[PDB]
Amino acid sequence: RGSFVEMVDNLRGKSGQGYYVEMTVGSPPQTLNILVDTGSSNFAVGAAPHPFLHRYYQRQLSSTYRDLRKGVYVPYTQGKWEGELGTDLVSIPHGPNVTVRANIAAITESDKFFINGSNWEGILGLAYAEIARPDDSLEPFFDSLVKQTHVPNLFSLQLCGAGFPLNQSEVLASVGGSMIIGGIDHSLYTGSLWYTPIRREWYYEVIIVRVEINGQDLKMDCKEYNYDKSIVDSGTTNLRLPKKVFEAAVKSIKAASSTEKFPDGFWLGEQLVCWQAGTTPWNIFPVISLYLMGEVTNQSFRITILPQQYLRPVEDVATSQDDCYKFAISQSSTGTVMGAVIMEGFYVVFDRARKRIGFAVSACHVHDEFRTAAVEGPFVTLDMDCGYN
Ligand SMILES: NC1=N[C@@]2(c3cc(NC(=O)c4ccc(F)cn4)ccc3F)COC[C@H]2CS1
Known part of the structure; x- marks a missing residue:
């Protein structure tokens, strides 16, 4: 209900x-x-x-x-x-x-x-x-x-990306999501909510313990993922990653998607790429999993996003019926930022009362019939020291 x-x-x-x-x-x-x-x-x-x-x-x-x-x-x-x-x-x-x-x-x-x-x-x-x-x-x-x-001292956010460009009229006429003040609305998500602690009450700071690209571990010391903090930020567009993590992730995403070559300016988040209407090759791009510290000691869970989250739809620079996108992962010098394109995958519960952030698969996330965003757990074999001081 x-x-x-x-x-x-x-x-x-x-x-x-x-x-x-x-x-x-x-x-x-x-x-x-x-x-x-x-x-x-x-x-x-x-x-x-x-x-x-x-x-x-x-x-x-x-x-x-x-x-x-x-x-x-x-x-x-x-x-x-x-x-x-x-x-x-x-x-x-x-x-x-x-x-x-x-x-x-x-x-x-x-x-x-x-x-x-x-x-x-x-x-x-x-x-x-x-x-x-x-x-x-x-x-x-x-x-x-x-x-x-x-x-109640809690709010929750369901940000809904359309998965395609919206012109000025359409964006005014369209529902972009929900902010539930004081509660959690069960209609906005599927599956279970999984909670990670709020590390400290300043930003909504969390701790990432492992990163995978199509199931392959990026294999960095987990402190790198939270250097110098990791936050959940609806006021930023991109998934932003610390320089060294960005470099390693982009290398791995390039390798996964290597059946097509994209220009440097695409990977720099500057230049759009376009495909003929309806032919975006989602399946060549990898899923990305971020493992977050669980509330239970020595447990973690993961959130998994699709390229439908990290490729941001944009209208073509010239008039066309092509489907175009920008790469919405970018480098940071101020830590990891889980921005709007990540939040579009999930219903996110800012449980201030219990000093924790909950994630569930969003009822409005964009996907295809082959893959969905996921929130899954628990994982009990991970090495978790991951916070930066
Ligand atoms: N979280 C941040 N908030 C601040 C801020 C955010 C924005 N946000 C956006 O334009 C935007 C656009 C697309 C999105 F999907 C999300 N946000 C604009 C001005 C601005 F000052 C206010 O305090 C620091 C500053 C920089 S980082």
Whole structure:
């Protein structure tokens, strides 16, 4: 049974541009679309005109706006945002039937933050206060929600990739998935949920203990997989891997798929590759298994993704009926990032109450009739020291 009908199908978007949920801020309520971001911890919204924003938070029109008289500056690798801190009443229309007073960073300047055509106007950082900006005294949204209401301290995400390109109209009209606030909806997954511990409450940090490509062990010291951390991050597109793991994985994926040769720019995630309509050779590309530490001592389980997850559908650079994709695995210098293309394979339970992350096969993962994504266990013979310090 699906017990959270009110919140099922409340997301829209896609791996290229992000998955978002509708929220309201202020009194009377101002509706905004907000990126669901498990890899940061600020609730930050556009609050001044911008060429890529169709709307924005207007603090002067909110009777419940409270000015904290404090700026926040947030540079990150790909860009930056800065703005002004305050609080206001916030609700999620397709969410729990509650309204909370939460911190809001009113974005006044940004660089490469907003995405033309994404249809979102702010971000909902769902990770922990430790990585909030300017510091850990700025209570994140979810903490406020839990403190102020009877909502259980847990949320779950089903991100649904289409498996093909969606034009602007289609992505607006399409259901992109679900964020279930306070619970687990059984209709969103098949098979069993398997849980891995949250190593530390800052990012949603986990520990990978083994990596296989088509069943072949990458055979790296498991610390390499978590150097310098491994996180589950809905606010990143790709599966990102530490440099040395990336190099070893790409070598192995190339070897598995070697019946076709792809240019270097494809493997660099820059260049698309295309096949005649319907003829994408899924079967030449390997499955990828990530083994995660179990809750039981000396046990692990694995999550297995298909090329239908790690090849991201993109429309052709020229007009055609070809099926085209970009390689959605890329190198990282800040650890492993299980981004949206990985999350598209799975229903993911962020069980904050029990300090654990659950994975099950998603009811909306893209596959073919020969192979599916999998979550399987337990495995009891693995060497598990895998965390980086
Ligand atoms: N997890 C991260 N969150 C941050 C962030 C994320 C994004 N996300 C996206 O555009 C995006 C697009 C496609 C996707 F499938 C997912 N996300 C945009 C701005 C931005 F600042 C906020 O804190 C650090 C920064 C960099 S890593």
